[model samples]
Target: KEMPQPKTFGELKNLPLLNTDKPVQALMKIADELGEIFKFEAPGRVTRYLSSQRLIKEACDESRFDKNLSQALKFVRDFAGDGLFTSWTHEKNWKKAHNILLPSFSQQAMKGYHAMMVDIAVQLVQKWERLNADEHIEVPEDMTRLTLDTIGLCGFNYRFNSFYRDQPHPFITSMVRALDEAMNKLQRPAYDENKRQFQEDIKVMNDLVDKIIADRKASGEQSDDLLTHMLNGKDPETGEPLDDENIRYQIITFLIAGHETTSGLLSFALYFLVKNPHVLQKAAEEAARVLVDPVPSYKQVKQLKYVGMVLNEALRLWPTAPAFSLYAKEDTVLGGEYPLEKGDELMVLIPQLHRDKTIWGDDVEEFRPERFENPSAIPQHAFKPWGNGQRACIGQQFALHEATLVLGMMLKHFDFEDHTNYELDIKETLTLKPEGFVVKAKSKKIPL
Candidate 1:
């Protein structure tokens, strides 16, 4: 029998196409009713939502890093990518950029970045210490600033000092607004009322990127940061330097994509730990055992394996980017059943696939870090928070190290109390984020 389908995309009040507020629930409901794969259509686009791990693997391998990029993502091209995250970039162009930048995020590079990450993590703890113990902290907001700060300092050798300011930098504000406008432009008509504002924001962000490049070039400084690597990097095939425009896109890509998703990772991780105190205590113990100083070395962070498990479990429950879209370049057969045309798009619902009972078993909904103790227990390409295949997140280790260090340091010094009445208030954007999750921090005295 054919799989079932959701209501017509046009008739649905909030189309999962553009509205993703309850996306996980909606996708799960559709999956349960429709089985592994289903179709969703909106105006001109028809997307196949896949929840099966095997099918998702097939689609991902077929599609790889080549994205059909939604109109929304294309709209973001004015700001986000011509280098790494760009949807319209040619395969050769993407490959060149990817190769040149690969070493910068390598394990050795991450080792060099450890000191910077540790310093920033300590800065965040100091910020938390300044707040009253009983004062409810906006965990997600703080985490957003923290990650932004970390990326700015370590990724580019710039300092956003995000937590130092009451408001986000104008560049960040404009970048975020531009992203939101682009997403909204997807559902609305081609002519957006915010089109002018959107363009202006993009210009502001682009100008900021240009200024940073110009300053770095003028300074003639040699550093190990990502910016330096990109500036000095040469295409292996062409032996040509990346143009200013492309370098700017790469910087913007790292600034926005690099940081926001990890912020969501830390936010959800903190929320989960707060609600699961026993787990938090266990993670804290792991942190204490592994981390003697306020922050951890790259080697030390890896030793906090239980904390890693807790983070992994949190990522499983609330993957920041809950879905990924892959476009078929040719007619393809998925899972030996579904026929997809060359232009068809596949929306891999990560949250649903992550919790698939068939793959994860009866305790799929439960948060169990022990499941990750034997990661081989899960099927290949089944648990991809950072994505799968060659095109997987290039900065996966960078993000993992950053989160593990920050969380480990924080857990070692303080206890987090869930203050949202234990409700999971999630806000869906390009990334899945906590809406207004609050937590209270109480200092813990650890004997050295």
Candidate 2:
């Protein structure tokens, strides 16, 4: 038998695109209704999306299916170019940068990065400390600020100094405008009217990259950081040098790619924390017990086990980089039944996939961090926030480590109450964030 489509007019009416800009969110609703598979047929091409854990498991077989760039991310290429995250899988620079930055896992490297992570986190702790109790803390803004500064200082030893200033850096404005425009281009082709603004946005991003690259040169210091690694280091195998343009994109990629999703992860975690008092209280108690030292050492960061579980649930509930694309390498059957052609593309709806009740249990919808206590027992592909295969996010370790440390600190020192009593309205443009989320932060610690 053939795969399913929205057969009836009412079923077709339920097809997402008409009612919401958040098609991914709506698609889950339609997928549950269809219950088999729903391929949206259009003149441009057919789009196939998967929600079942069983189907998702077979579809992700690296032997049969391979990673493909999605429609939206192709638009990202205009700004990010061939940077590590936005590059085509076939692009050589992807491997080169991956190799150059791969040595980032060294204990020496992580311990070095740990101090920078805590440094930016301290700035945030201080910023919230000064906030008047009545003021609503913009959760998304400050989360981005902390992540951006942490990436700047650690990735290349630059400082956005985001906490010191009232206004966000111009690069932040340009990057957001450009990335939003990237997703915008997906819905509407690059119309002539929109072209110039996008070009200006890209130029702003590029200008900052040039400054970041040039300033490092002027200093003439050979710091063993990501930027220095790109400028000075060679590929371990090919011995190829990273060119000037590629280095610039790499910087932009680091600044935006891992940073936004991580910020969203932190923001969503805080949102969930405020919404669920019991979970927040348990997490806070764990945070209090864990941060015995005022600042968390690398060793102590590991001991943030429950906080780590809170992160796990946050990611499970909201994988910020929500969906990833896949395609068939050859004519093959998905789940040993559904036939797919060689070139037809597939997108894994991670938000839907994560909610598979069989694997996650009947209480899957509930936000419980204890689900991670025995993660090894869960089936593979049943809970993949990092994505699938070697094509998965290389930055998961980096993101997880940074998120755990900061989340621990935030819970330990400050208590956040949702000031506006807002509901979760996810905003999506390439990635997702809780739109218009705010909190009142009360500091429990005096400045060290």
Candidate 3:
């Protein structure tokens, strides 16, 4: 069974609009149609609705979800060949590939990422030290820019003076503009009248990528970074390297997904600590206990249990993907009742799930990190920031490492004190973020 669909954006409004606003109503209806699988199916519907329209075809193709993510998945995986290592990864294919190409919590690559953080942090310290010698620094924007710059150098081997100068350099400016244009082009009207603009933007992205590819080839020397790794990455069985176009997309994807998520997580962590003094003290104590001998290394990251809980709690309250939508592929057994076919949409309300008192108890509204101490203590699917099932975010482990490193470093060195009660308005364009999280960061005499 398939649902009639509108091929163009203009007919999106006229199409059978999937009811997402009444999720509770959908749930109740689904329970009657589907009995046991209702629980899974309900969430599945919501998730599918939250995803991009581009992913609809993949969900319909059972084979695509099983072995690989066809369009986007192939683009990401063919770029990162984890299957090549005869020594590892026989069971988990995509995950293993991601581990090989991306930063793993267990790998030494984290140390490199950590070092980049310190280098960037040092610049922040210098600026703060110079400007506010008498008082604590209250965010200079440069601090945020510094983190972005660090991710570029350490993650992708790109360079920009975004952190060090008054204005972003040309490479930084042009790339960011082009990326925004490319992303916007995805949502443009496909009608014949507006087709030129969309095609023009696509050409812009292709040209930008072409330039990067040409530059890399012309340099003839590798930079010992992610780009080099991607270019040299080979499929062990086939002995084939990632193509240049694949590398470009992966690089663009990396730039788009990174920095924003980490910055949001880091800023939110700081906000929570300042708002709850008792928790802040407890977190610092944990840092003192674990990071006393040395900086929180990869080995020590796991031991910072309290710190992990704090971040988890923050994630629960303000999930990056607050509400995601996906389109149904075919007439399947969803909620056991509603005859969902291809083109039907669903939206997963994450905040509602996270805030459900029945699932989280009466204190669901409270900012308590202790809830994460035993995840089984919470109801199934109560908290889903990274999502679940086969289509979970590939950067889960990497994000964990990044959050731990950034928060651990900040909490250990500076006290994030909330002042002026500056209301942080939550906004979501792509990632959930806040404006003017300006908190005072003062040096602390905490033990190593």
Q: Number of clashes in every candidate structure?
A: 0, 0, 14
* Candidate 2 per-residue lDDT over residues 30-83, each given as its tens digit: 777876367876445677888878888887788888778777777887878888
Instruction: List residue ranges in candidate 3 displaced over 4 A.
Output: 1-112, 133-147, 175-224, 236-239, 293-296, 376-380, 445-448
Give all TM-scores, in the order shown: 0.93, 0.94, 0.69
Order the candidate numbers by TM-score, best to worst.
Answer: 2, 1, 3
Error of 1 at 122 (Å): 1.2
Query: Per-residue lDDT tens digits of candidate 3, residues 1-448?
Result: 2322222234343223334433333443343343222213221122233122122223334422222222222222322223221112224443334544643323565655665655565555445445463455434254347656766666556666575687776545544454444334433343564445444544554566557667877887676456767666665545555667655655555555555666677667777778889999999888767765435566777688888899889888777645544445555544333465565554554555565555577775688999899876765455777754544554556566666765666677776656667686665534556667677667674433
Model 3 global lDDT (CA atoms, 0 to 1): 0.55
- Lowest-lDDT window of 10 residues in candidate 1? 9-18
Give me candidate 2's TM-score against the actual structure.
0.94
What candidate 2 gets wrong by more than 4 Å, as runs, is 7-18, 105-108, 189-193
The most accurate candidate by TM-score is 2
Q: lDDT (CA) for every model shown?
A: 0.78, 0.81, 0.55
Question: Higher-lDDT candidate among 2 and 3?
Answer: 2
Of candidate 3, the 10-residue stretch with the lowest lDDT total is: 80-89
lDDT per residue (tens digit) for residues 29-127 in model 1: 777778778887655656778888878778777443345566656777767867677644456668778878888888778988887887778788888
